[PDB]
Design a protein around this nucleic acid. Structure first.
Ligand SMILES: Nc1ncnc2c1ncn2[C@@H]1O[C@H](COP(=O)(O)OP(=O)(O)OP(=O)(O)O)[C@@H](O)[C@H]1O
Ligand SMILES: [Mg+2]
Ligand SMILES: [Zn+2]
Ligand SMILES: [Zn+2]
Lengths: 343, 256, 51
DNA sequence: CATCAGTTCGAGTCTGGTACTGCCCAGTAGTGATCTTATTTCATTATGGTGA
């Protein structure tokens, strides 16, 4: 039996939930995006910025979590002789339930999330406000000006030299209030990456494509990855999607495997290739069914918690706009050669 | 969220009817701080402190907090430390486990030297600042210095024993014996209905002298090294032997 | 207390505002004001001359 | 008999229980000065279709 063991049936529904919610799946798209992301992380080659575009609710965070855990369990053997080197840093850091993104808040959050992993007592930040305490935590004030916080964060990032600086939901970096330009914000972040030498992998949804290429310096230093969705036009991609559905069915914590394969195309209208969204929808449906103690999932349950068509078409339009902005074709290549002058 | 000196000055001292309590509650109550040892003693000031804390807090077992239960079996002659005694290892263990840091009664005994739980002699001076602190200062705090105000605990402390296999092991065994004896004494405090009296020491001495000393004191005095005058004082009058002397006699009998 | 009184008197005679710090700065042991009467005497002198 | 054990007297030493002294620092709330910033106006600037 390649599926879930038959001993998870006698356990209450809470144990089934606690087994399923931390259970992840390996679709080929995830494997390929993880491989390419791990490769570009391991050799950055003077790339200050990595941009990771992708749809919402596809697994772009399941991917980041796997990256962090792998980078940790790689650097842990190296932590027996190398001191003050965090294997991975992954945060959101952009307007946490805030009206406008603040640079001071971003700097202080980066500092506190960069130091809290390790209980270090010998670090002397180049500042008079931020310091450590006997308990080993990081003590910050509300008085230090933003340049001082920038100095402290730069010194910390230089001394610690983390592999990555994973930031999530970065599309809200554009919340610049009024009177500011986006190129200034990228210049500041790329500068931080320059004097520090760290790799900033900005992930998130398609809004990110707002920054794709602003300046030539930004253009040459940026490494772009597109975590593309599942598109029904490709036949092998449809095969992979239905196979993912089977894999869900085989590991679905139920007495018997319910019949949801036949509704594959219907699932598409509720999924649009967003594997994350499908996972949340299935988890909510199974939780609701198991609250009523139902051993099988039917089409009625799928129609009870199904997504709304208006929301689906809205995200479809957003995804189409993003893909047509990202789209690359032979015409672009030929235009590049024509501009260059290579006959 | 107030300093212990402030709590003593503004909440305890006015509630105490003694003249010096009220007077020193307005010019610095240094009398109660320079003699914080006696707050844990057998005497009237310790009992008054327990009574006032009971009035302030309305508890029912604050008498077990001190060894006032044994006001008839001990003696404050060279018994209490003038300076603080703490185990840093216990401080971190309790802090890291999430429990509260609590100063132990056993540490206040001059006879106790090491921590039975973490096998290390207690510290009697602040490692960061070479200054002494009494058992209760104006800014005392669990786990902090009374003058520097920094954490005194450590996973590994800065004090270690000397290198020697001649008498260091015997001294360590004696310290373990004394610490275990006092710990069992404190533990049996709660189970015991009432404290043994001085007459209990009288009959115990009558038994031991008549057991192996065939009713003589010179042999016993030479065996324990104490002058015979003190032996007569212990065995005839209402004089309580010192705790060190008491458990040295016990060790000579090899009985707790 | 007397010495404080002549100090505040002379300081006002010259023209400066006689405050606690200024009076302390020209008196050899500027810590006696912790006594509950010296400060009272200084305040009484200030009120007598109108502060 | 003279040695050693059981008794006394008074001094040595600690310590609790009780009161008291000589001294300046630290925190907070006024003003006046000088920047500093999320946010509100004063012009040009491009887009628009039709009757003389
Ligand atoms: N491959 C997967 N296996 C299991 N669960 C998954 C998978 N991909 C996504 N999820 C689920 O998706 C939820 C989180 O949303 P998801 O990571 O898919 O969104 P996202 O598109 O990365 O988010 P955002 O747009 O905010 O960057 C979690 O409940 C997680 O279990
Ligand atoms: Mg995400
Ligand atoms: Zn301990
Ligand atoms: Zn200290």
């Amino acid at each position: 039996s390649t599926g879930f063991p038959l001993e998870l049936l006698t356990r209450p529904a809470t144990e089934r939930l606690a087994y399923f919610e931390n259970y992840t799946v390996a679709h080929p798209r995830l494997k390929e995006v993880y491989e390419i992301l791990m490769r570009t992380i391991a050799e950055p080659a003077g790339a200050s910025f990595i941009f990771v575009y992708g749809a919402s609710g596809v697994g772009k965070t399941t991917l980041r979590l796997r990256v962090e855990q792998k980078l940790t369990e790689l650097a842990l053997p190296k932590l027996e002789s190398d001191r003050a080197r965090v294997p991975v840093v992954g945060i959101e850091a952009i307007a946490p339930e805030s009206r406008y993104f603040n640079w001071k808040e971003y700097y202080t959050r980066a500092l506190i999330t960069l130091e809290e992993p390790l209980i270090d007592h010998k670090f002397d930040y180049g500042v008079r406000g931020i310091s450590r305490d006997n308990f080993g935590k990081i003590n910050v004030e509300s008085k230090v000006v933003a340049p001082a916080l920038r100095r402290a964060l730069e010194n910390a990032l230089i001394h610690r030299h983390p592999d990555v600086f994973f930031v999530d939901e970065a599309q809200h970096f554009g919340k610049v209030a009024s009177g500011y330009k986006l190129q200034d914000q990228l210049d500041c972040l790329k500068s931080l990456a320059n004097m520090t030498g760290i790799l900033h992998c900005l992930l998130g949804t398609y809004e990110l494509l707002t920054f794709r290429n602003l300046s030539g310096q930004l253009s040459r230093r940026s490494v772009d990855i597109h975590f593309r969705r599942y598109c029904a036009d490709s036949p092998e991609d449809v095969q992979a999607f239905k196979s993912v559905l089977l894999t869900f069915q085989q590991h679905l914590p139920l007495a018997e495997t319910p019949n949801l394969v036949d509704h594959w195309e219907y699932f598409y209208e509720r999924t649009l290739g967003c594997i994350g969204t499908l996972k949340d929808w299935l988890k909510r449906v199974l939780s609701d069914a198991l609250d009523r103690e139902a051993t099988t999932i039917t089409l009625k349950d799928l129609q009870k918690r199904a997504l709304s068509v208006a929301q689906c078409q809205k995200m479809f339009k957003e995804i189409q706009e993003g893909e047509r902005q990202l789209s690359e074709t032979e015409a672009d290549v030929q235009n590049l050669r024509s501009a260059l002058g290579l006959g | 969220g107030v300093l212990p000196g402030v709590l003593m000055t503004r909440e305890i001292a006015p509630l105490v009817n003694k003249i010096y309590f009220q007077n020193g509650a307005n010019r610095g109550f240094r009398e109660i701080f320079n003699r914080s040892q006696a707050l844990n003693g057998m005497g009237e000031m310790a009992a008054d402190l327990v009574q006032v804390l009971q009035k302030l807090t309305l508890r029912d077992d604050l008498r077990f907090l001190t060894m006032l239960f044994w006001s008839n079996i001990l003696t404050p002659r060279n018994l209490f430390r003038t300076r603080k005694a703490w185990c840093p290892i216990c401080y971190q263990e309790r802090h890291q486990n999430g429990l509260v840091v609590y100063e132990q009664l056993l540490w206040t005994i001059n006879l106790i030297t090491i921590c039975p739980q973490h096998q290390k002699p207690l510290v009697e001076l602040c490692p960061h600042c070479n200054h002494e602190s009494p058992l209760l200062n104006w800014r005392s705090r669990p786990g902090y210095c009374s003058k520097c105000g920094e954490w005194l605990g450590a996973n590994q402390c800065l004090k270690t024993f000397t290198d020697g296999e001649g008498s260091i092991k015997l001294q360590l065994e004696w310290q373990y014996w004394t610490a275990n004896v006092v710990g069992e004494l404190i533990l049996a405090s709660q189970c015991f209905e009432s404290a043994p009296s001085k007459e209990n020491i009288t009959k115990s001495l009558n038994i031991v002298i008549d057991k192996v000393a065939e009713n003589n004191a010179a042999a016993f005095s030479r065996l324990i090294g104490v002058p015979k005058n003190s032996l007569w004082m212990w065995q005839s009058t209402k004089t309580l032997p010192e705790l060190n002397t008491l458990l040295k006699i016990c060790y000579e009998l090899e009985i707790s | 207390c007397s010495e404080v009184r002549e100090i505040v008197l002379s300081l006002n005679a010259q023209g400066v505002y006689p405050t606690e710090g200024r009076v302390c700065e020209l008196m050899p042991n500027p810590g006696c004001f912790r006594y509950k009467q010296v400060r009272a005497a200084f305040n009484d002198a200030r009120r007598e001359f109108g502060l």
